[PDB]
């Protein structure tokens, strides 16, 4: 039953993802708890964000054909397209990444099997842009 509602909310999440971006066809993977950090170069250390929640990797019916979002447990989400300017570095249970703006990030995973699996998935769908 806990998983019935689980399946349910993954159905509703897809749909919510779609109302904000309709090129979206399906969720490729999701995780339990993840939390977002950003790197501050000036101060030279990591800094917490207000972002913490569930991570969804989804496919799109148009380039960029992949994206990922952290739906926050306030209402400010992380949204990130999977293009070739995205680069990753895995340091379990953290997943570091840089994007087009050159801003630096770390996704901490609670479950380190999620960390490995998503890291692998990303690497696959970065090789495909």
């Amino acid at each position: 039953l806990m998983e019935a509602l689980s399946r349910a909310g993954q159905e509703m999440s897809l749909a919510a993802l779609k109302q904000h971006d309709p090129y979206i066809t399906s969720i490729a993977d999701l995780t339990g708890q993840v939390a977002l950090y950003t790197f501050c170069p000036k101060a030279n250390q990591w800094e917490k964000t207000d972002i913490e929640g569930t991570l969804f990797v989804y496919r799109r019916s148009a380039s960029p054909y992949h994206g990922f979002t952290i739906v926050n447990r306030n209402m400010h989400n992380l949204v990130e397209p999977v293009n070739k300017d995205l680069e990753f570095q895995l340091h379990e249970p953290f997943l570091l990444y840089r994007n087009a703006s050159l801003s630096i990030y770390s996704i901490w995973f609670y479950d380190k099997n999620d960390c490995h699996r998503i890291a692998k998935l990303m690497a696959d769908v970065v090789e495909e842009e």
């Binding site: 990591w46 800094e47 570095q89 340091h91 840089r98 050159l102 630096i104 770390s106």
Partner: peptide, 14 residues
């Protein structure tokens, strides 16, 4: 959720 004491990013990213 770890204190902001994660590992450093690849040197070349900075």
């Amino acid at each position: 959720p770890s204190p902001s004491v994660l590992p450093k990013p690849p040197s070349h990213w900075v």
